[PDB]
UniProtKB/TrEMBL annotation:
It comes from Pseudomonas aeruginosa (strain ATCC 15692 / DSM 22644 / CIP 104116 / JCM 14847 / LMG 12228 / 1C / PRS 101 / PAO1). This is Carboxylesterase. Belongs to the AB hydrolase superfamily. AB hydrolase 2 family. One of its GO terms (molecular function) is carboxylic ester hydrolase activity. Residues 11-212 form the Phospholipase/carboxylesterase/thioesterase domain.
Amino acid sequence: SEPLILDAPNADACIIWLHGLGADRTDFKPVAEALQMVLPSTRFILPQAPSQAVTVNGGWVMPSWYDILAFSPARAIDEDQLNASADQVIALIDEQRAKGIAAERIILAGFSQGGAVVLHTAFRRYAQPLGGVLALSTYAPTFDDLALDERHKRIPVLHLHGSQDDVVDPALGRAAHDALQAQGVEVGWHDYPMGHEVSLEEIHDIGAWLRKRL
């Protein structure tokens, strides 16, 4: 399926938001529309993860950005599929730049599995530094090989997590934040008394963070 696209009048920025394991591209549409109120000239692109087999679940096929081989180590993933997903994101970024949107005004966002993809895209693969990353209830298994040059250190990041998350451990979420911090990246952290989900308070905080950068 193609990406859901929420255009904006005279769009001068773009947010590419990825859903989590097994979800649908429409999952974050209400979130995107809420944020468009905050950012009236920002376009939102919500891609759909392809349906593939997910080992850790019994091999069943469902929307997945990359195969997860075990519950532990979190690092046990199919990195080739992860890179294919990262390439799908890079293709969307390339398209927006070709349309005139500055790279500095393209921000990636992801919830859980989708968050691991955007963190990987921005900090391990895409050469041109982006305007920022939103990482919700997620983790970054490939940050074990994080090796930033000065230009990528300029990418701001906001990490969000439910302190009661029973799917992605808040500690794995903090570990991604800590790895970037250790490498000179400007990072923010906000947790909430909730589980593996999204809350309106969380969306208000994200809007304020974005308003400061767009």
